[PDB]
Amino acid sequence: STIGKTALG
Amino acid sequence: ASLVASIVEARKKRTAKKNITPYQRGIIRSLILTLDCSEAMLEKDLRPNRHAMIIQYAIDFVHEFFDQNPISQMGIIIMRNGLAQLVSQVSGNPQDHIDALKSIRKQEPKGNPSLQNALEMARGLLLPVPAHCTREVLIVFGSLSTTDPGDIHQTIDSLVSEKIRVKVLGLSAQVAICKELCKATNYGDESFYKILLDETHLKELFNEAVTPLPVNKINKGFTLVKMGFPTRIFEDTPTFCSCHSKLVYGGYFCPNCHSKVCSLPTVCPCCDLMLILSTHLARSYHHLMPLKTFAEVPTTEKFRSEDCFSCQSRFPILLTSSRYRCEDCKQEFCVDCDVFIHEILHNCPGCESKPV
Amino acid sequence: SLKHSVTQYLEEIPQQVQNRLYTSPATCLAIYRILPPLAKFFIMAMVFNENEVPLLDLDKWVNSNGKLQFQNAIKSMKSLHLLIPNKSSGTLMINLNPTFKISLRNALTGGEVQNSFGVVVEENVVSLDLLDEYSANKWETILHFMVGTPLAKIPSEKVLNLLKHSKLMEEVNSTGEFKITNEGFQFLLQEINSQLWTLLLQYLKMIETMDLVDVLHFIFMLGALEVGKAYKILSETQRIMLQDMRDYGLVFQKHSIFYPTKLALMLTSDTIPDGSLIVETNFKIYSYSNSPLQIAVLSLFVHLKARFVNMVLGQITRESIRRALTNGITADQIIAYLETHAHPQMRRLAEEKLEKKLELDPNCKEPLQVLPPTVVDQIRLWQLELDRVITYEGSLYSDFETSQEYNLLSKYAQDIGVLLWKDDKKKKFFISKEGNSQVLDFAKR
Amino acid sequence: ESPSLLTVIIEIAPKLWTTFDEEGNEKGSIIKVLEALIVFLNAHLAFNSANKVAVIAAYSQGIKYLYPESTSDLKIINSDMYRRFRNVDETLVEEIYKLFELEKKQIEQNSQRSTLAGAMSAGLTYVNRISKESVSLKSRLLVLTCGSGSSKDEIFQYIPIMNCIFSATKMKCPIDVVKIGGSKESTFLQQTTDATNGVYLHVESTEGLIQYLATAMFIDPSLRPIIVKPNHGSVDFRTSCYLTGRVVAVGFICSVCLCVLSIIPPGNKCPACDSQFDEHVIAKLKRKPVVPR
């Protein structure tokens, strides 16, 4: 589950 | 009706256990374990695959076999690529056999099995073993066809000449040659070839082979074996071991050549007399004089007491009294004690308490 | 946690107070049971020997492997002043506290105990009918008030005041109501034994001038008493505190004689399942809990929809999780409650998934998950929504004549950990309101 | 950090204790051990509330359970004593009170063999039921024996006691032995203690037995690996010959019934299995060492 990882961009 | 069903079911099961006599059994034995590692092992009948379950249960059998029989020695062979491959020399060290089986884990089975090649290799392995030892072969066969380079019937006759008894645990269905091999080598007994019917039954078949087999009247092997009991020695400075030539702090000093051996029970590396402790002999006494099976008391007859003699557990009031009394001392026991007193503990508590 | 939390509280007690506490054998037995298992071994050996024993011999008693345990055992004993060291003739001797040694010896053997354990009256009362029901009702009532659900009966004023002063279940006069904070929900999650000590420890802290030693002796003594078997009513401070425990349900009085409650026995030490629930990917919840408390606690962060006698069914909605987070509950607690009360079917299905995953690729190992991943992720994301925008209170400093002064002020604020934002290009920096006074004082000097 | 069941097997035979009392200056020394045992049980119960206790007695005409009292009252201990300890102590004192009365009634009856082996077997069975009932308790066995009194025979006691070692090892249940007798050590009990990671202790005088029990015997199964066994003796793991009856360093065993023999039996036949032996094989064994002529 990816929640805290930096948002893609 | 369930409670009475359990009792009658137990009685039916207990019926097979009712008959027990002190059959003479060879405590000292040499067993060559042959395992089938061929394309037939890739089948998924036994999850995950036949190879994995056989190898895993082999490890348990090795541990159980050397715990019940400490003096015995064992060897491991595997049929692979149409040839019999030796994976561990016949010895009395369980660790070596366990390690050999562990290595075989990764090996992928392939090719066809060869009973003759395995039996010929097993025949050679069981030659140096002393005469007093009872030769034994435990083949775990999984295929339905055997490809041999020669006439296997000659090997069966040779095995009978060398007094080698073969036990075969088939996996799929009966095989004509396997049945003949077991029957011929077991003095005509046809009960030494068994094919399982599910995963659970395999463990029971493996555990059964642990116990020593009875010997026939005609066969004679009575003899004496020279042995000694070494004394554990504590030393401040480590010393070289005669068995492995390695530095070990402690060991057992031989009572003949004073050579130190890392572990027991093993043949002395110098004067080749089997060193053992009194406990090793003790473990096998219960086989010689098994404890007589208990008979359930009738409900009508009165009971000696309201509580179990050994563990003091009240017998449930309940249909049929759940009391089992030992014939020799006539003292009731519970169901838990009945299984315990005949599987783990090998002496009836009441009999020892009785003063003669 | 009781084996450690209670130990920490005892250590904080002054040495003189601890020596007084060891007078009662009953307390000594309780203090004996809380020490590490290795400490028990050494203490018991020293109880029956009236002589000094060197520390080296005690070290020799332990094997090489268990050296770490020995270090912990000696530290714990020294912390509680149980072992008194003496240095003389170049030898470090250790002896047991005479007060603790004598009291502990009296407890084990038959001797004078000054009626510490009480006196039996031979008047037994059925526990399954009255004492158990009384204990459940009192604990049920106090817990219901803690959860916030309406309930006609109100807890006594003394317990209400303790909760008000207590950190958990914060109450706000401006709102005019009482609400559950993060600590309050943690208390609910904790087992009965942990919950009981949680309240008892707070009461011990609150009481000032009822002597502390007298209260502690009664509490430890209460554990010794068995369910039922009333004992004759003991210091005056104990009597009033006994009434307080009665309000808590720890003790039952017929009006003369007080019957120890089942909770008292539970206070001594430790010792489909009820309360379990199923969470589906559709966010529905079905809890097989018939207890009134289980429904109330679940309703805190779940939008209940209907109920049967056998079970209660609801659904997680943005409103429910939002309400719980606003109260003060963290998303981690919400998942923890759901996982610990997972239905056996969910556990069985999760195990099957893990087995299949291991079969596909046993090289990689992952933790077993009982709840569906999506439900957990959605709850976590909802919490992140509340913290979407962060607001700080402070002041902004700018318009600096020289860059050096601005840099020095920014560095000073960062050092004391009160700088929130800075920008050298604009020569501006914003600091927290807490550090505003410190920054202003530094600027003046 | 888990409960540990403690089973005590105490051999109380008037013949053994009477000899010990007569040999020593003290009279009625059995009381000292009995009272010390009560303190020992209290100490075990104080270690942890969860753990339990069991006591088994092996008297002349059989074995009885001192505690727990069978489901099927005099005041002897202080009433103010803690109820948890008082219950065990009161029942034990009542049971031993009755047991001594039965022994007095059966004094005329004569017992030619000891019953320690039966009690040890009974104790192991009690351990088994406790583990079966609860699913999760460690177990331990303590044996109190007196060696001052003369023993008519002990070979019969080898097989039963030896079997218990395997049973104890399977459950990983240590068995400790405390001996109060003239002889420094035995041969069977000592082997039992060292074969299952247990403590063996011998005390010359009954006085001060509590110190021994509290310091040495008081090793719970939870912390067995980290504690060092105070036992100082060394077991030999040897057995006496069938015929000569002497400890054998190098000897012979027949493959049939597995019985030790220091020397070749007369008649070339095993004393035990009554089975003949080939003359050729025994001749090979009797061969003298090869020496230059």
Added chain:
Amino acid sequence: MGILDEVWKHKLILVETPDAQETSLALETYRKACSNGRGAILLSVARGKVSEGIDFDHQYGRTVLMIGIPFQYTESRILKARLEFMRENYRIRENDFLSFDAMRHAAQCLGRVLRGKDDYGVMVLADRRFSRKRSQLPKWIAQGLSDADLNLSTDMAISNTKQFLRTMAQPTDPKDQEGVSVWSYEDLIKHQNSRK
């Protein structure tokens, strides 16, 4: 197609041939392979010479596969003349006799598998038309045939065969067959007394 190649891995392949002596040698090899554990498969004709007399018991016969109904060549002048004569004289329908002739030759092959009562073997009648001819089999063969097994596929038959062979290898309780499937002298005397 290469199907025989896959067969060669598991069993030797022996085939009946017009020469009588060569067929005898094939039977000798087929028996030897079965006895020594190598395993062999015998391809023969239902209406041939091997079916009339050679008994494939115990290890020799563990599975019998009937590839089609052994029908006679319908377009034969001799057969047509006999059928017409039989119909006019003995009043036997042509179709009835043809089924009778085919079934007798299939039944005889099936019956060569068993020598005693301990012997076991799996009989396979691989043909669509055998489904409706169950009543024409010998009574003892029909009794062992089940309704579920009346119309089967290859996958179902193989799964059924595997379970059957596994079960039949297990030891049988003597009490089960002590006095029902086999009679001792005492049992025979008891039965005789009961009749009288």
Added chain:
Amino acid sequence: ETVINAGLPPSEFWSTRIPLLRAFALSTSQKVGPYNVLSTIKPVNKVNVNLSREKILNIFENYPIVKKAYTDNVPKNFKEPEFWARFFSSKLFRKLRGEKIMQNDRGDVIIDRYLTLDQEFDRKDDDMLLHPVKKIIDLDGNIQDDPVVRGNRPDFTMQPGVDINGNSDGTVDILKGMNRLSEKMIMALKNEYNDERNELKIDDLNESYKTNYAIIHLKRNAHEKTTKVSNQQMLQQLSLVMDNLINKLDLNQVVPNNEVSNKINKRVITAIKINAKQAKHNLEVKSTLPIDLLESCRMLHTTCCEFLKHFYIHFQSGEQKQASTVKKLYNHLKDCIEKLNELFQDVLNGDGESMSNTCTAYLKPVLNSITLATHKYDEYFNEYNN
């Protein structure tokens, strides 16, 4: 170590290692069983077919004709690889594997010339296989049991298929090949390296097999180990303990005195210290000696143990003729004692006595065993001989 510098006879060394030698020999003296090698080869336009040395050997063994064709062409006609390419493209390969011989194809010019030789070999093999058959299963007699029967000839469905011209279809030829291949495999198994009556009898009706396991009843009467009060006294003691227990029991008295408690504690600690001295040192264990010296000690110990093992084997052999061999072993054993002493002297002058004590302790048990062997041998030699 034990045969170059030691000088022990090479033959004696292998005497005690027989099982290891036998296992090694059997690891290469066993061969797989016969099988249809050609049926395993699948060509899988260009097609790649793989071969292995084991595969090549199997083809030669099962099919002598291929071996005869190969042996001629090995270096002479062309290189080996070209042979297999020609062979697999020839009609001989098709015939050998039982494939029906289609209309004359390209095949191979050279290999096809051996078809006549292959047919001759097959005829010879068929003659060898042919032999009298047991009358129980014989089928020639059945057809000839009525030599005069001249009934109607069977339809074409009961006869081998024939072509329009009347020539044989050719299916029977491949069928006979299967029979020949199976017979060749089974006959090859039986290499140099009333019966029917028993089979016909129904076994199920025979008497059930009865076990004949022996039974033994051991006598539990063994000798006792070898290097009383009156009833009234027992009753008096029993009464005294009975009165004491009922009267009053004081658990406080259980506490020991100051002096006795110290003595009890001292004894327990002393035993613990001795035990603790052993439990701290109860992959190879770390050694203080240098690696090079340690390895030398390992070599000396290993050779010393080997000498002792052989000496005891001959000493206990119980054969007078072994005396000659025993003498040499004894002399070798004596020399080892000097070597052990010599090594200690070298360490004494090499390590300055610092490691000499450690080295002596390491080799002390083996040295004690060797000197014991000499004393036992000398003592027996002295009295018995003279």
